Design a protein around this ligand. Structure first.
Ligand SMILES: [Fe+3]
Ligand SMILES: [Fe+3]
Ligand SMILES: [Fe+3]
Ligand SMILES: [Fe+3]
Ligand SMILES: [Fe+3]
Ligand SMILES: [Fe+3]
Ligand SMILES: [Fe+3]
Ligand SMILES: [Fe+3]
Ligand SMILES: [Fe+3]
Ligand SMILES: [Fe+3]
Ligand SMILES: [Fe+3]
Ligand SMILES: [Fe+3]
Ligand SMILES: [Fe+3]
Ligand SMILES: [Fe+3]
Ligand SMILES: [Fe+3]
Ligand SMILES: [Fe+3]
Lengths: 144, 144, 144, 144, 144, 144, 144, 144, 144, 144, 144, 144
């Protein structure tokens, strides 16, 4: 699996997670509501940035980003969430597991782009790893 | 078709159009590139607001917003765009036709919510009509 | 009961609730203290805006707003709170019930002002309903 | 008289009042000069917004806004002011009477647009009524 | 009369004056309307800060602030104003006399808190005296 | 023709051009719509500043600015535009010719005010020439 | 009297007027107190800028600005004000007469600097004339 | 123990608490993570201000602030925390006890500086007491 | 010498020092020019604040501030500086000695206002001491 | 060719391109004038940053940046543009080819600095590649 | 030598001085490093503004600005600096002499543009003289 | 020595240098006082950021940051400074040598993290090297 393919799969994961976290946003229950509600807004606004970043990296490489939701659904490795009620504990557990998935995928992006001498994608992959590793650390602490 | 059903169909249209306009964003060609590129960013940021607005209106009404992309695709009336190259003329024509569709749908939202005495949804529907009518006017002028 | 009378009763409720929520502000206990303390500040600052809005709507209609606390106490439908210690759960339950009361009263304001052809008051009533319905939704979620 | 006709007459009134209030701006006498001078600036900047708002509402409806001063003068119901010296009392009396005129005209705009099912114009008419009713209240108080 | 008692009486005066000055705000007549209207807004926003400051000082001392309007009315030394029409001269005279009252009361707060070694309350009392003495000076000049 | 007369004729031209450019604003057609629409807004906001500047210069000189639209129409040298549809090319050509006219008139203002020793008007005339010469240069480039 | 001499006399007038207007600031009586108090602050902050501007112009010319109050008093043409109570009418009359004096002096600065080919001082003199002529116009209107 | 000695001991406590609270910052566990994490950042940024304030007060008095960590450790009365995992409850209890300690020490600073006639240090001590008393109140409420 | 007398003498010192430091501002020589030039601007802007503060404190006490430069010169204890060339070393030495003078005078203000029970003036005196003691410390370091 | 040599050649290219793009800025013709004019300003402001960045990287490495235009002209690989009239199409083609050149040169900077273990220059080279690749993508789209 | 020729020679001087001052920026030695480094940045950012100003003035006059570095070098009267190490004293001396040169050249620009009746260029020349005369004054003081 | 060990030693160096530079801050002597005083504040605010950055990197790696000053003192390689008086020359020499030390240590962090495939730490190490290399360059210039 080569660089543009990894990016396209990640673009698909970003839009799917943009959606899944909106679900958490709307359907969180319990007294720390304002907190989760606030934090989920910042998270899905991050996914939409990731989505746009990945797409423009694909274009700059000479390839076509994904341009439909059905292609997103075809290419994603993320399970969509159908439940409609959550406490902060359940939401943080879900987001953690997805963060861990993305962390593995950005690690492969980094390593594969290095093998092809694509320095700009390495730098981009390494910047996302830094953000993911920090969020994973924080979420791991929420659950302890 | 009752108020929450109309809202849910519109929520589905917003996410699908959020995606379609990203396509225009990435794939516009020609010398007014910066202009289109800039304008499409403002448009899909509007769809994501519309998406979140509609969802929270659905929740406040006691119902569940849509929480998956496959439900978006099931409920939408919008055709997804598979082409990957455009000039500003082609993009503006597409966006106009979709604006006209939404304008009809928000008109039905307004009228149906009035029949049920749902004043808050009327006000919301009427605010979106004002924005749509202004954008339609402007787009109609781009194409003249 | 006619438009200016409904407004005056609501003006009385706003000042009384401005006070009741200060009580919650000062007397909240437990580890989410900063959260409640912050949120109550935003709530009673909203009541004081509501108080000033209702008063100036009364004046514009040709009538006198209420100008004393004893008239507030005479006209209010809100029970004053004498307790001086609370957790976030108790505070959110109280505020919800009062929000529901105001929501019924703004609904009557809307309907009565429509019967008299007072469009400006309808618009104002409908704007407050939108805010109340959103806050009710959120508070209902805090308690689930 | 139908919706676009009422709007066009109002567009004509806005430009004429934009001018009349500049006259007050320049020609106010007495020790509260800074006050009037300041307030008239805010008033004619409001008329120019009203002028541009009405024009773009006319365009969105499929019709042509007025595009010349002589058409403004043909269609206006406002008497132009030829005097060149005033105290604050004289200025506030003039502006009040014109505000009352506009308030009647926006009331007809609201009612006529309702009869045609033009929701966006109703909302716009109702927003201007709210501003006019507040300014009328204040000006009525200046003169008491 | 000991420190917390003086504070509680002052808390009662602040809410009562918050109300009385709203009356001036709404019911001022004459050509300097914008001025009074503006100044009264800044004054009652000061009383609400004073109200919240005094309450939190009471809490920090281990005691309960007042939490109802009827307790405000029981403890206040301020006469509520029932009239509903004023010129700037009448309003400034009223506010001056109330400022003088508060100045005497904050002087006693300062002296009593010194006798108990309550340095934080002294500093707070002395800060309010500085504000009151400046406002008294200015109001005394309005009336000369 | 003496200084105050030249200023008054220019005041008349500014209001007439304020109007003519609103026409361009509303009635521009073609794909660079956002651009023209944006630029015309900045242009007529400049004319309204010019209008107010000229008027206050007239007042400071001891004379009366023009205070009616019919006096504007009597004194102007600008032809009002009755057409209601344009491309950017047609709009820029129109605005250029009017800029050239104003440039000649501000040159006469400068020279005549110098002959009377009116230094403040010279400085003002010279500042407007600088702005006009820059805009003329730019518009001349649009059409090449 | 040559350029640096005119500047030095003006520097002396600026500091003396800085002081005289502080007197007005502190000692104004009557209900428009806030207005005068505000306006005098802006006026003496202008004199202190004028003072610093004139001084640095003197230095740039190779000469020494005045560096003591007694030299200010020796060189000034302004009468110091010993009274300690005023209404807005008395204050505006005083400031007008001093503005007229400065206007004559800046006119001589302009003409003398022209005779010596000192373009920078001309430009500076002409900028102060513009400010003075505008303030004179406004003050003349306060007194009508 | 004289004024500069009390200040130096407090400087030592501030740096030690700056460190201890970083520990809480990094090692907090549980779902209100964002809250604690946020609040601890604001707390240790306060200690570093206190540290710099105390040091510059010592210098202004003619003495040397502490300039090494080992001198901090020699002079501090605060126990360093070696544990590396906490919930919000444990953190708030720790911070409260340290706040109470500092409150006693600033009380002695105030009283000792009064005995020496050092007014600036009294004012500084009294300002820190106000902040400490407010934070103690809030923390006491977190634990109820 | 009683409180208002001490204040009036200090008002006289502030205006005289405002002037003396302008001299330093204009006439500093050497390579750290920008530094001194910058710092002197901040210093004389402080004196003008001190001047206005002292004056309004005098007024609030029922007395007349000084309103002429000749009264400033009569009452000041500060020697005016006639030299017109300095290095940073000479300027800092001068400013230090004047700071020390003011520090003694504000100490007497504090002590005398305490004897009369004038708490607001004490607080004001103590705030100026804090600023003076900090500046003295810094200037003493410049010269070491 | 070693790291400092590559940097110095790039410094020479940046100043030469800073100049060439000013030419485009001034001499662009056609109706999208504002667009090009705006974009060229942002481009040559980027070259001047690149120029200063490269120079300070050279200095930090122990070597001398280029300090004359004739050394710029000696070392540059960029052809200077002598034509003085362009449409947006011609300008974008020119800038693209130069962007491609710089992209090759920054790729060599990256690879050579890696061979010498100069991590800071690699990071800097990789950051410029990211910017260049994005601009190349966009310009390539302008021309399609 | 006529107006456009003088401007073009000055454009050449601005780019050459932009470069020479970058040299000072990078190569200043000694403890006031931050100061020089800061000041040189502000100076060469001024030259680049001067460069762009002169160029656009040339274009507005109907002529071609210089568009290559070799034309800059051909037309300049400024000696390029080849040294690569300086103290603040050496840098300020260099910049002063170049400021004096530009001051003579802008004086000729002013006088020649007056002879041709080119008012806009006079105003521009006179504005640059004001800036140059102020900087010359300051630099002359650095060296005393 | 492995990655987390290098980070922990650096965390210890950051807190120790945070302290040492406070010493320079407080105890600098001579006329460029404001400069050093300002620069040291920016430097120790950088160390506290470095301290917090290193700590959170340690936590994200699964290890415990240092949480006591005595552990800082145990692990540091930096000599604490006991002197209490300095000129800018002495301070800059000290800070340079410590910057050089940190530069060697961040180089080892980079190389060791590369050997373990820890990309996020490499990126972080390389970002600190860039800052250190720039500061070293500047400090080296201060001392030349
Ligand atoms: Fe994008
Ligand atoms: Fe939301
Ligand atoms: Fe209000
Ligand atoms: Fe518009
Ligand atoms: Fe609305
Ligand atoms: Fe509060
Ligand atoms: Fe105006
Ligand atoms: Fe000018
Ligand atoms: Fe200055
Ligand atoms: Fe400090
Ligand atoms: Fe204080
Ligand atoms: Fe004042
Ligand atoms: Fe730089
Ligand atoms: Fe430009
Ligand atoms: Fe942190
Ligand atoms: Fe990076």
């Amino acid at each position: 699996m080569k660089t543009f393919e990894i990016l396209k799969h990640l673009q698909a994961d970003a839009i799917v997670l943009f959606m899944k976290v909106h679900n958490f946003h709307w359907n969180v229950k319990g007294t720390d509501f304002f907190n989760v509600h606030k934090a989920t807004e910042e998270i899905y606004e991050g996914f939409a940035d990731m989505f746009d970043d990945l797409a423009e990296r694909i274009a700059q490489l000479g390839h076509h980003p994904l341009v439909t939701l059905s292609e997103a659904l075809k290419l994603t490795r993320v399970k969509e969430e159908t439940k409609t009620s959550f406490h902060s504990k359940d939401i943080f557990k879900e987001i953690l597991e997805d963060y861990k998935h993305l962390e593995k995928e950005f690690k492969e992006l980094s390593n594969t782009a290095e093998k092809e001498g694509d320095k700009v994608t390495v730098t981009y992959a390494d910047d996302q790893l830094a953000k993911l590793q920090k969020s994973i650390w924080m979420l791991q602490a929420h659950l302890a």
